From a paper:
Hence, spy49_0662 was expressed with a 1.4 kDa C-terminal V5 epitope tag used for Western blotting followed by a His6-tag for immobilized metal ion affinity purification, and the resulting protein was coined as HupZ (heme utilization protein Z). The tagged HupZ is a small-sized protein previously shown to bind heme, and it exhibits a trace heme degrading activity in the presence of NADPH and cytochrome P450 reductase (CPR). This protein shares some protein sequence similarity to the members of the IsdG family. In summary, a comprehensive biochemical, spectroscopic, and structural characterization led us to propose that the observed heme binding in HupZ is through its His6-tag in a sandwiched di-heme complex from two subunits with an oxygen-derived bridging ligand.
Residue numbers in the entry:
A (entry chain B): 1 to 120
B (entry chain A): 1 to 118
The structure:
């Protein structure tokens, strides 16, 4: 689903994560740790315990954008997300953080449902 | 209000614009023409019939982010937005576009309400 073309662009750019709270206010947060779990799933390490984690638990709806500013090319990923603090996803994230950053407060997981580029 | 370092990021970084549709699905996309109209207001040139435009028209809810990857610094601007296709803001947008881009289809105006650090 997520192609090699998408992966290369992803690997270079900063993930910008958009969510929405209970009152319908959008939130944007960069997530440096965002990465592919497999070719249909994103995973990131939740280090901040901020509005992104709240919104994900609140309603799960999410979009992630990556923009290549050298050509204004990019990809956007619409999916459903959840936050977990124990279990396989969390343990993988905990393993991944060793050497890179601190122990994750939680892990965020995003199941990709639709993929757009920057057009329209 | 809007500090000089905020203006540095606004003028040098790419505006990432988050909105939401009637069903609660967030949307996000870049707007190269996003700029300070004054110390309390953003405006940008709407060149599309895209989802960002539709969402602002629907409910006016918005957040704009700017990120300097180089210094790991950023700002989030919370506000309420509207789309206009005629009038003073639109005329100003149309004038600004001359020598920069095509004639705008519309203008987006955002009243800033709160500012956050990243």
């Amino acid at each position: 689903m997520i192609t090699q073309e998408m992966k290369d662009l992803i690997n270079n750019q900063l993930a910008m994560v958009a969510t929405v709270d209970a009152k319908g206010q959008p939130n944007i947060g960069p997530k440096r740790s965002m990465r592919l779990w497999d070719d249909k799933t994103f995973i990131y390490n939740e280090n901040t315990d901020g509005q992104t984690r709240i919104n994900i638990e609140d309603n799960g709806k999410i979009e992630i954008a990556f923009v290549d500013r050298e050509r204004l090319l990019g990809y956007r990923f619409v999916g459903t997300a959840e936050i977990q603090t124990e279990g396989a996803y969390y343990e993988a994230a905990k393993k991944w953080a060793q050497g890179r950053m601190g122990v994750p407060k939680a892990v965020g997981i995003i199941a990709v449902e639709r993929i757009f580029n920057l057009q329209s």
